[PDB]
Amino acid sequence: FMQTLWNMNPICSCCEEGYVTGGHVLRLFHGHMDECLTISAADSDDQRR
């Protein structure tokens, strides 16, 4: 019942089609046909760093 005041602040809004904005998840592909920046596989002693 005690009053706590809150702010309402927008992160995003409507967006033009085919335009990349912040917050989306993508695949970063560098090369010609098939290559991407990846992290090492599970275990394999690389520690995924």
Side-chain angles (χ1 to χ4, degrees), residues 1-18 20-28 31 35-36 38-44 46-47 49:
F1 293 120
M2 291 55 78
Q3 164 160 22
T4 287
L5 320 89
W6 297 79
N7 287 70
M8 274 211 52
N9 175 321
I11 291 324
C12 196
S13 208
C14 278
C15 179
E16 331 317 298
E17 198 59 39
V20 155
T21 71
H24 286 94
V25 180
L26 60 175
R27 263 138 177 98
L28 282 174
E35 189 182 59
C36 44
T38 76
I39 302 317
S40 46
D43 288 19
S44 312
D46 191 64
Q47 304 310 112
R49 303 283 204 151

Coordinates of all heavy atoms in Angstrom, one line a residue, unseen atoms left out:
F1 N 0.8 -1.2 0.0 CA 0.0 0.0 0.0 C 0.8 1.3 0.0 O 0.3 2.3 -0.4 CB -0.9 0.0 1.2 CG -2.0 -1.1 1.1 CD1 -2.1 -2.1 2.0 CD2 -2.8 -1.1 0.0 CE1 -3.0 -3.1 1.9 CE2 -3.8 -2.1 -0.1 CZ -3.9 -3.1 0.9
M2 N 2.1 1.2 0.4 CA 2.9 2.4 0.3 C 3.2 2.8 -1.1 O 3.4 1.9 -2.0 CB 4.2 2.2 1.1 CG 4.1 2.1 2.6 SD 2.9 0.9 3.2 CE 3.9 -0.6 3.0
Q3 N 3.4 4.1 -1.4 CA 3.5 4.6 -2.7 C 5.0 4.6 -3.2 O 5.8 5.1 -2.5 CB 2.9 6.0 -2.8 CG 3.3 6.8 -4.0 CD 2.4 8.0 -4.3 OE1 1.7 8.4 -3.4 NE2 2.4 8.4 -5.6
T4 N 5.2 4.0 -4.4 CA 6.5 4.1 -5.0 C 6.3 4.6 -6.4 O 5.5 4.1 -7.2 CB 7.1 2.7 -5.0 OG1 7.6 2.3 -3.7 CG2 8.3 2.6 -6.0
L5 N 7.0 5.6 -6.8 CA 6.8 6.3 -8.0 C 7.7 5.7 -9.1 O 8.9 5.4 -8.9 CB 7.2 7.8 -7.9 CG 6.7 8.6 -6.6 CD1 7.7 8.5 -5.5 CD2 6.3 10.0 -6.9
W6 N 7.2 5.6 -10.3 CA 7.9 4.9 -11.4 C 7.9 5.7 -12.7 O 7.0 6.5 -12.9 CB 7.2 3.5 -11.8 CG 7.2 2.5 -10.7 CD1 6.4 2.5 -9.6 CD2 8.1 1.4 -10.5 NE1 6.7 1.4 -8.8 CE2 7.7 0.7 -9.4 CE3 9.1 0.9 -11.3 CZ2 8.4 -0.4 -8.9 CZ3 9.8 -0.2 -10.9 CH2 9.4 -0.9 -9.7
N7 N 9.0 5.6 -13.4 CA 9.2 6.2 -14.7 C 8.9 5.2 -15.8 O 9.3 4.0 -15.7 CB 10.6 6.8 -14.9 CG 10.7 8.1 -14.1 OD1 10.8 8.1 -12.8 ND2 10.8 9.2 -14.7
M8 N 8.3 5.7 -16.9 CA 8.0 4.8 -18.1 C 8.8 5.3 -19.3 O 8.5 6.4 -19.8 CB 6.5 4.9 -18.3 CG 5.7 3.9 -17.5 SD 4.1 3.3 -18.2 CE 4.6 2.7 -19.8
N9 N 9.8 4.5 -19.7 CA 10.8 5.1 -20.7 C 10.9 4.1 -21.8 O 11.0 2.9 -21.6 CB 12.1 5.3 -19.9 CG 13.3 5.7 -20.9 OD1 13.4 5.2 -22.0 ND2 14.1 6.6 -20.3
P10 N 10.8 4.6 -23.1 CA 10.8 3.6 -24.2 C 12.2 3.2 -24.7 O 13.1 4.0 -24.8 CB 10.1 4.5 -25.3 CG 10.4 5.9 -25.0 CD 10.7 6.0 -23.5
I11 N 12.3 1.9 -24.9 CA 13.6 1.3 -25.4 C 13.5 1.4 -27.0 O 14.5 1.8 -27.6 CB 13.8 -0.1 -25.0 CG1 14.1 -0.2 -23.5 CG2 14.9 -0.8 -25.7 CD1 14.9 1.0 -22.9
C12 N 12.4 1.0 -27.6 CA 12.3 1.0 -29.0 C 11.0 1.5 -29.5 O 10.1 1.9 -28.6 CB 12.6 -0.4 -29.6 SG 12.9 -0.5 -31.3
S13 N 10.7 1.5 -30.8 CA 9.5 1.9 -31.4 C 9.3 1.3 -32.7 O 9.9 0.2 -33.0 CB 9.5 3.5 -31.5 OG 8.2 4.0 -31.4
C14 N 8.4 1.8 -33.5 CA 8.2 1.3 -34.9 C 9.5 1.5 -35.7 O 10.3 2.3 -35.3 CB 7.0 2.1 -35.6 SG 5.4 1.5 -35.2
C15 N 9.7 0.7 -36.7 CA 10.9 0.6 -37.4 C 10.7 0.4 -38.9 O 9.8 -0.3 -39.3 CB 11.8 -0.5 -36.8 SG 13.4 -0.6 -37.6
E16 N 11.6 1.0 -39.7 CA 11.5 0.8 -41.1 C 11.9 -0.6 -41.5 O 12.7 -1.2 -40.7 CB 12.5 1.8 -41.9 CG 12.7 3.2 -41.2 CD 11.5 3.9 -40.7 OE1 10.5 4.1 -41.4 OE2 11.4 4.1 -39.4
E17 N 11.4 -1.1 -42.6 CA 11.7 -2.5 -43.0 C 13.1 -2.6 -43.5 O 13.6 -1.8 -44.2 CB 10.7 -2.9 -44.1 CG 10.6 -4.4 -44.3 CD 10.1 -5.2 -43.0 OE1 9.3 -4.6 -42.3 OE2 10.7 -6.3 -42.8
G18 N 13.7 -3.8 -43.1 CA 15.1 -4.1 -43.6 C 16.2 -3.2 -43.0 O 17.2 -3.0 -43.6
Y19 N 16.0 -2.6 -41.8 CA 16.9 -1.7 -41.2 C 17.4 -2.3 -39.9 O 16.6 -2.7 -39.0 CB 16.3 -0.3 -41.0
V20 N 18.7 -2.4 -39.7 CA 19.3 -3.0 -38.5 C 19.4 -2.0 -37.4 O 19.9 -0.8 -37.6 CB 20.7 -3.6 -38.9 CG1 21.6 -3.6 -37.6 CG2 20.6 -4.9 -39.5
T21 N 18.9 -2.3 -36.3 CA 18.9 -1.5 -35.1 C 19.6 -2.2 -34.0 O 20.1 -3.3 -34.1 CB 17.5 -1.1 -34.6 OG1 16.8 -2.2 -34.1 CG2 16.7 -0.5 -35.8
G22 N 19.8 -1.5 -32.8 CA 20.4 -2.1 -31.7 C 19.5 -3.0 -30.9 O 18.3 -2.8 -30.9
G23 N 20.1 -4.1 -30.4 CA 19.4 -5.1 -29.6 C 19.1 -6.4 -30.3 O 18.7 -7.3 -29.6
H24 N 19.2 -6.4 -31.6 CA 18.9 -7.6 -32.4 C 20.0 -8.6 -32.3 O 21.2 -8.3 -32.0 CB 18.6 -7.3 -33.8 CG 17.2 -6.7 -34.1 ND1 17.0 -5.3 -34.1 CD2 16.0 -7.3 -34.2 CE1 15.8 -5.1 -34.3 NE2 15.1 -6.2 -34.4
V25 N 19.7 -9.9 -32.5 CA 20.7 -11.0 -32.5 C 20.9 -11.4 -33.9 O 19.9 -11.6 -34.7 CB 20.2 -12.2 -31.6 CG1 21.3 -13.3 -31.7 CG2 20.0 -11.7 -30.2
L26 N 22.2 -11.5 -34.4 CA 22.5 -11.8 -35.7 C 23.7 -12.8 -35.8 O 24.2 -13.2 -34.7 CB 22.9 -10.6 -36.5 CG 24.0 -9.6 -36.2 CD1 24.2 -8.6 -37.3 CD2 23.9 -9.0 -34.9
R27 N 24.1 -13.2 -37.0 CA 25.3 -13.9 -37.3 C 26.2 -13.0 -38.0 O 25.9 -12.4 -39.1 CB 25.0 -15.2 -38.0 CG 24.9 -16.4 -37.2 CD 23.7 -17.3 -37.6 NE 23.7 -18.5 -36.8 CZ 22.9 -18.7 -35.8 NH1 22.0 -17.8 -35.4 NH2 22.9 -19.9 -35.1
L28 N 27.5 -12.8 -37.5 CA 28.5 -12.0 -38.2 C 29.3 -12.9 -39.1 O 30.1 -13.7 -38.7 CB 29.4 -11.4 -37.1 CG 28.8 -10.2 -36.4 CD1 29.8 -9.7 -35.2 CD2 28.6 -9.0 -37.3
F29 N 29.0 -12.7 -40.4 CA 29.6 -13.5 -41.5 C 30.6 -12.6 -42.2 O 30.3 -11.7 -42.9 CB 28.5 -14.0 -42.4
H30 N 31.9 -13.0 -42.1 CA 33.0 -12.4 -42.8 C 33.5 -13.4 -43.8 O 34.0 -14.5 -43.5 CB 34.1 -11.9 -41.9
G31 N 33.6 -13.0 -45.1 CA 34.1 -13.8 -46.1 C 33.2 -13.7 -47.4 O 32.5 -12.8 -47.6
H32 N 33.4 -14.7 -48.3 CA 32.7 -14.8 -49.5 C 31.4 -15.7 -49.6 O 30.3 -15.2 -49.9 CB 33.6 -15.2 -50.7
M33 N 31.6 -17.0 -49.2 CA 30.6 -17.9 -49.3 C 30.1 -18.4 -47.9 O 28.9 -18.3 -47.6 CB 31.0 -19.1 -50.1
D34 N 31.0 -19.0 -47.1 CA 30.5 -19.5 -45.8 C 31.7 -19.4 -44.8 O 32.6 -20.3 -44.8 CB 30.1 -21.0 -46.0
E35 N 31.6 -18.4 -44.0 CA 32.5 -18.2 -42.9 C 31.9 -17.2 -41.9 O 31.3 -16.2 -42.3 CB 33.9 -17.7 -43.3 CG 35.0 -17.7 -42.2 CD 36.3 -17.2 -42.7 OE1 36.4 -16.0 -43.2 OE2 37.3 -17.9 -42.7
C36 N 32.1 -17.5 -40.6 CA 31.6 -16.6 -39.6 C 32.5 -16.6 -38.3 O 33.3 -17.6 -38.1 CB 30.2 -17.0 -39.2 SG 29.9 -18.8 -39.0
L37 N 32.5 -15.5 -37.6 CA 33.2 -15.5 -36.3 C 32.5 -16.3 -35.2 O 31.4 -15.9 -34.8 CB 33.4 -14.0 -35.9
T38 N 33.1 -17.3 -34.7 CA 32.5 -18.3 -33.8 C 33.4 -18.4 -32.6 O 34.5 -18.0 -32.5 CB 32.3 -19.6 -34.5 OG1 33.5 -20.3 -34.5 CG2 31.7 -19.5 -35.9
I39 N 32.8 -19.1 -31.6 CA 33.5 -19.5 -30.4 C 33.7 -21.0 -30.5 O 33.0 -21.7 -31.1 CB 32.6 -19.1 -29.1 CG1 32.3 -17.6 -29.1 CG2 33.3 -19.5 -27.8 CD1 33.5 -16.7 -29.4
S40 N 34.8 -21.4 -29.8 CA 35.2 -22.8 -29.9 C 34.1 -23.7 -29.3 O 33.3 -23.3 -28.5 CB 36.5 -23.0 -29.1 OG 36.5 -22.3 -27.8
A41 N 34.2 -25.0 -29.7 CA 33.1 -25.9 -29.3 C 33.1 -26.2 -27.8 O 33.9 -25.8 -27.1 CB 33.2 -27.2 -30.1
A42 N 32.1 -27.1 -27.4 CA 32.0 -27.5 -26.0 C 33.2 -28.2 -25.5 O 33.7 -29.1 -26.2 CB 30.7 -28.3 -25.8
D43 N 33.7 -27.9 -24.3 CA 34.8 -28.5 -23.7 C 36.0 -28.2 -24.6 O 36.3 -27.0 -24.9 CB 34.6 -29.9 -23.4 CG 33.6 -30.1 -22.2 OD1 32.9 -29.1 -21.9 OD2 33.6 -31.2 -21.6
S44 N 36.8 -29.2 -25.1 CA 37.9 -29.1 -26.0 C 39.1 -28.3 -25.4 O 40.0 -27.9 -26.1 CB 37.5 -28.5 -27.3 OG 36.4 -29.1 -27.9
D45 N 39.1 -28.1 -24.1 CA 40.1 -27.5 -23.3 C 40.4 -26.0 -23.7 O 41.4 -25.4 -23.2 CB 41.4 -28.3 -23.3
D46 N 39.6 -25.4 -24.6 CA 39.8 -24.1 -25.0 C 39.3 -23.0 -24.0 O 39.7 -21.9 -24.0 CB 39.2 -23.8 -26.3 CG 39.6 -22.5 -27.0 OD1 40.8 -22.3 -27.3 OD2 38.7 -21.6 -27.2
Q47 N 38.4 -23.5 -23.1 CA 37.8 -22.7 -22.0 C 36.8 -21.6 -22.7 O 36.3 -20.7 -21.9 CB 38.7 -22.0 -21.1 CG 39.7 -22.9 -20.4 CD 39.0 -24.1 -19.7 OE1 39.1 -25.2 -20.2 NE2 38.2 -23.8 -18.7
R48 N 36.6 -21.7 -24.0 CA 35.6 -20.8 -24.7 C 35.9 -19.4 -24.6 O 35.0 -18.5 -24.7 CB 34.2 -21.1 -24.2
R49 N 37.2 -19.0 -24.3 CA 37.6 -17.6 -24.2 C 38.2 -17.0 -25.4 O 38.3 -15.8 -25.5 CB 38.6 -17.5 -23.0 CG 38.1 -18.0 -21.7 CD 37.2 -17.0 -21.0 NE 37.1 -17.2 -19.6 CZ 36.8 -16.2 -18.7 NH1 36.6 -15.0 -19.2 NH2 36.8 -16.4 -17.4

